[PDB]
Amino acid sequence: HKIEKTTQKLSETVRPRDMFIHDDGAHYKVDDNALYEEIWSDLPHWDVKGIKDISDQYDKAGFKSWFYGIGGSEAKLDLQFSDTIPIDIFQTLFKWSNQSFEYSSFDHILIPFNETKANKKIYLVSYSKQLILEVTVESANYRNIMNDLKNRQSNMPAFSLFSIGSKKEFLLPNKPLTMDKKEFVTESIKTNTFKQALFSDPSIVRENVLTDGISRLDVNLSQRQVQFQQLVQSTSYQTGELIKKSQKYLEDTGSWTDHYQFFNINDSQQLSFYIFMDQIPVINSTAKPFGATSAITVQWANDDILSYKRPNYSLGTNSETELMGGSEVKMLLSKQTAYDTDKIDQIFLAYQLLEPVWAMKVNGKIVPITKDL
Numbered sequence: 401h402k403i404e405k406t407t408q409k410l411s412e413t414v415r416p417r418d419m420f421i422h423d424d425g426a427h428y429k430v431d432d433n434a435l436y437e438e439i440w441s442d443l444p445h446w447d448v449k450g451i452k453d454i455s456d457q458y459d460k461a462g463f464k465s466w467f468y469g470i471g472g473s474e475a476k477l478d479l480q481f482s483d484t485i486p487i488d489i490f491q492t493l494f495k496w497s498n499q500s501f502e503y504s505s506f507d508h509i510l511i512p513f514n515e516t517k518a519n520k521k522i523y524l525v526s527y528s529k530q531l532i533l534e535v536t537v538e539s540a541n542y543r544n545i546m547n548d549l550k551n552r553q554s555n556m557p558a559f560s561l562f563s564i565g566s567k568k569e570f571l572l573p574n575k576p577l578t579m580d581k582k583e584f585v586t587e588s589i590k591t592n593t594f595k596q597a598l599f600s601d602p603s604i605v606r607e608n609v610l611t612d613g614i615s616r617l618d619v620n621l622s623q624r625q626v627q628f629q630q631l632v633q634s635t636s637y638q639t640g641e642l643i644k645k646s647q648k649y650l651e652d653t654g655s656w657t658d659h660y661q662f663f664n665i666n667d668s669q670q671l672s673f674y675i676f677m678d679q680i681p682v683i684n685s686t687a688k689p690f691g692a693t694s695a696i697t698v699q700w701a702n703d704d705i706l707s708y709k710r711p712n713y714s715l716g717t718n719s720e721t722e723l724m725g726g727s728e729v730k731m732l733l734s735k736q737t738a739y740d741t742d743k744i745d746q747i748f749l750a751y752q753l754l755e756p757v758w759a760m761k762v763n764g765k766i767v768p769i770t771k772d773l
Contacts, residue, residue: 401652402596402654403597403653403654404594404597404653404654404655404656404657405655405656406656407651407656408647408650408651408659410489410492410493410644410647411444412661413650413660414489414493414643414647414662415481415661416440416479416481416509417480417748418748419436419477419478419479420478420559420571421475421476421513421553422467422468422469422476423469423476424470424471424475425470426560427468427559427560427571428553428557428559429557429559431557432552433679435548435549438545439477439479440479442541442545446522446539447537447538447539448494448497448535448536449536449538450535451498451501451534451535451536452533452536453533453534454533455531458530458532460530463532467525467527474513475512475514476510476513477511477513477549480507480508481506481507481508481509482507482746482748483507483663483665484505484506484507484526485507486505486639487501487502487504487505487506487533487640488639488640489643490506492644504526504533505526506524506526506533507525508524509522509523509524509525510522510525511542511546513549515542515546518538519537520539521537558574558575559571559572559573559574559726560574560726562726562730563730564730564734565733565743565744566741566742568744568745570744570747572725572729572730572747572758573723573725573726574725574726576722576724576725577722577756578721578722579720579756580719580720581720581755582754582755583715583717583718583754586713586714587713588712588714589712589714591608591617591619591712594617594619595610595617597654598628598653599612599615614630615629615630620692621712624712624713625709625711626709626710626712627708627709629708630701630704630706631701631706632701632702632706633668633700634669634700634701639665639669642669642671643662643665643671645700647662649698649705649708650673650696650698655696657710657711657713657714658682658715659675659676659677659716661674661676661681663681663695666764668699669699670697670698671698672696673696673697674696675694675695675711677716677754678751680750680751681749681751682750682754683752683753683768684752685752686767686770687772688753690753691711691713691753693709693711694711694753695710696708696711697709697710721755721756723757729747729758729769732771732773733760737773738773739762739767745760745762746760746761747760747761747769748761752770
């Protein structure tokens, strides 16, 4: 079973895009990575006592004040994901025995500060649907962890909510941010390496475009992209399962050339995984286009993978610039003409092919919010 490189745990593949502390009209980004890693690694050990849906306990205004620790509402640690994560996934990651709410999914896990009783509460939240699952839990380290957070809070980058478009608001810096830049010179993978690992039997592949009569492997060097296809589209797999299957598949084929994380799943169930550097998404710049796609894309069939598209190179080993603050981001998107801000779904930090930049998700498309306006 030819492989290609290293091993990756599910908790490494699907995890929060970032972490924020919301409280009293303020918002602080948890930028210390070791702290992010500490929270993420300890969370799965918080033993679940019970789970209950409490969505009906809040109206629109209530939900928002609570979610962001407005006024008297306790401050909240917000673990933001890139897509609504199926509850099936959280159950696996945390070894939960729970089996109800089988159809729910969430894009945020929030943890309130000041939980003193033995029974503490965390919440699985699907923001736009305002759905909330209250998870009662026991934690040996909650107190220590929430203590560090609260103490390092003051020196955390300050973010606020900017209303861009007329339908949503986006977490963005109060002022510009200073972040390190690029590096380069990939590693690249030989077409033969993909062949030996992707075909169940490389001895019969022929014809660079290679096939074994029932599976094509296209390596386009100019696009720095490899493609592996086989003709249906799964029907027996629910979102959670497709994600699990993708994890196992990328693991069994040694696809983890770099640290890849699940980003989201398509309307047509195409799962996207991106290369992450410093817990930051690595995307492709608009102009000076390096490659054609920097994300691993997986499409499943009922008993086989339909298509797998990925980079034919790797990175990850070893300047300085300023990224707009948000008022600068708002004003820009305010007069760019290209896209309609009412269509912006998400705005987030991303390295560009590696330069810190703000990226937006507009109608599935992911565009670098740069002066290339």
